[PDB]
Each structure stands twice: as C-alpha cells, then as structure tokens.
Amino acid sequence: NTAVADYQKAKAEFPQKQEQYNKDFEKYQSDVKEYEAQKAAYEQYKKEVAQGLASGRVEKAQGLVFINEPEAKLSIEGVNQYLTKEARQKHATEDILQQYNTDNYTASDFTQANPYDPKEDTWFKMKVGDQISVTYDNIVNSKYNDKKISKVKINYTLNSSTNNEGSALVNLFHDPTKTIFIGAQTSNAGRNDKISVTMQIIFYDENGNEIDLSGNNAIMSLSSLNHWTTKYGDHVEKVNLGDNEFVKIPGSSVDLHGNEIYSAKDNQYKANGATFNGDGADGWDAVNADGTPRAATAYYGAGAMTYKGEPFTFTVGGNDQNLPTTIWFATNSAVAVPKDPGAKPTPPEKPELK
Ligand SMILES: [Ca+2]
Numbered sequence: 016n017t018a019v020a021d022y023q024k025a026k027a028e029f030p031q032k033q034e035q036y037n038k039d040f041e042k043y044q045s046d047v048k049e050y051e052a053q054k055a056a057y058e059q060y061k062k063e064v065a066q067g068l069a070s071g072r073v074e075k076a077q078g079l080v081f082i083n084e085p086e087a088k089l090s091i092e093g094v095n096q097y098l099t100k101e102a103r104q105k106h107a108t109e110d111i112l113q114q115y116n117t118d119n120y121t122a123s124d125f126t127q128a129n130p131y132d133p134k135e136d137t138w139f140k141m142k143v144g145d146q147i148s149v150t151y152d153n154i155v156n157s158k159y160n161d162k163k164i165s166k167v168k169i170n171y172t173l174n175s176s177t178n179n180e181g182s183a184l185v186n187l188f189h190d191p192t193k194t195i196f197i198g199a200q201t202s203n204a205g206r207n208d209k210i211s212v213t214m215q216i217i218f219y220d221e222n223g224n225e226i227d228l229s230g231n232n233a234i235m236s237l238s239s240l241n242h243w244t245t246k247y248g249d250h251v252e253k254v255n256l257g258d259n260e261f262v263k264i265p266g267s268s269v270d271l272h273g274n275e276i277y278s279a280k281d282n283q284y285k286a287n288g289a290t291f292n293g294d295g296a297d298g299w300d301a302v303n304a305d306g307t308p309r310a311a312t313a314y315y316g317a318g319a320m321t322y323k324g325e326p327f328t329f330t331v332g333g334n335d336q337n338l339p340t341t342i343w344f345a346t347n348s349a350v351a352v353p354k355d356p357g358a359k360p361t362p363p364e365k366p367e368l369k
Contacts, residue, residue: 032366040362053312070264073319078161078232079157081164081347084153084190084192087191091137097127102124115199117180117200117339139184140182142173144174146170149191159226172213175208177208177209184198193306194214195343197344201338212330218233234350235319236319236349238351239252240253242268242282252329255275255327255329259322262350314351314352
C-alpha cells in the first residue's frame, strides 16, 4: 500500500509537469514548422536531381573534389604587413569582433617580413587595391574530373573596407578549402561601407599545368551568406559571381538580385521572419573549427556556383558604426543542400492525473 505517497507525489508534481508540457508543446509547434520547411526543400531537391533540373547539377555535374586539405602549405606574394606573432598572441583571447577591430592595432603590430611558417595559418593586413597571390601545395585529397590536383593558386584583392584606413585584417588558413577570415572596424555611421574582396582560384594538375574548367563540372559552395537586421546593423553578405554561374539551392534564403547573390531579407532570426535561427550550437550557421557545417539546415543560408575559372567578389557590410565587420568566406566543393529531416515531430503527451 503506497496510495497516499503516490497520490501526494502526483499532486505535488503536477504544476511542474504542466509547465514542462507547455514548453514542450511550444517546441513541437516550432519544430513542425521547421520540419515542413526542410521537408519541402528536400523533396524539391530530390525532384531537381531526378528530373535533371538546373539545381540538380550539384549532384549530377560535380567533378570537383576540393573539401579537406589539412596538410597544405602556403607561399604568399604581395603582402607587406604581416601581423607579428606577439600581436596575434595579445589579441587571441579577445572576442572575435574585438580581434578584428582594426582600431586596436598599431603599426608596431605589423612587420614586412613574414614570421609565419608555410605550414600554419597566417595573419596579415590587406591594403585596398593591392592584389596578393597565395600558392597552396601539399594537396593530397583533391581532384577535378579525375585529374588529381597538385597545387592551388588563389589571388585576393581588397576593393574596399569598412574602416577609414583602406585596410582589413586577415587570417589566411593554410588549408585553401577554408579560404579567409577577414574583418575591420566599422568606422562610419550610415551602413553603407563594405569589405569587398575579389578572388580567383586556379587548380593545377600533377604536371603543373592549369586545369581547364570549361566542362562546367566545378560546382563550388557559397554558403553562410548571412543577412541579419538588428539595432546594431543591417548586415548583408553578398557574392558577385562575375562570369561564373549561379546554382540556386532549393529552399534557400539566397537568390540572384541583379548582379549579386544574397538573402534579400533577414535569414538569421525567426523573430525577424527567418525560417530557422542562425545563431547557437543548433543554428543553421553553426560551424566547426574545420569550417564544416554542423547543421542539416545549412542550405538555408547558402548558394552555389558553377565555377568557370573567372574572378568573383564577396562583400559584407551594413553594420552600425563601432561594431566591427567580419566574414569567414570559404568556398570549396561541399555545397550545402537540403537533407532528409527524418520523421515529422510528434506532439508531447499531455500530463494527466486521471
Ligand atoms: Ca557567413
């Protein structure tokens, strides 16, 4: 006989069980909406692949494997201001936005002689209008149309900055599939300056010749094109593809607008109308240190291109004054597409005393 104890426990716990139910039910309603969006995008993508629609080229046309090059080493031409290792150390514990606050660095933090080994990530300031050329070798995992890739060259040119010094701070990864993390102070009010970088990638075969991409099999990612709108900015990340060709990702917030691809509306906060939240461990934009997306919903912030070997330009701007502008821009063969969301969420069981 435990009737009294059991009755009193069930009665005492009921308010908490009801509060947990309300939270679980709200979460279920939110999850159903996310599931329906993911399912629609996945079904559309499957149809595009099966029927041979344009976006099916992500699967059907891909001949480029260029996703992971953790052994690559760098040779850099055209950089005149490398960040000293002492200055890198001094800024390493700061918030990311402060690490890229160019107001917090002075001339004594930079040197003309590169202190970084070829095998490690390298830091430097870029100067508007000065093209740099980065050659990456020790390429072990990559190929294009069954031509193993021996080397990659990427040229980068800073066209504009958000600061008033014509400069931006860069962390250049030794693995070229991680590309570049760039930022600067946002020195002016008015949301109208931007960091703009033109890039061009050349792949080389085992005999050292440049690889012709005109079979149109190099499908490259343009993921993580955030657009957030808050009291602190109308921050938009964009790509001008130049002579390369846009590949629309089904269900993505990113589309073609004249000359550029980006998300026309906020894609970062459900509170601002986005379908998925971008922030946090569970957000669509979550990434590992390797740059790999953590989220099956990464497609929501992504575009892609058929890369034809010609220059393209990424931009980021719209922050308010004094909030440093940053972007981790990567491009590689790992296009973010909708994935199978699994089974539809089921509602929580309502707690009862009966
Ligand atoms: Ca981004």
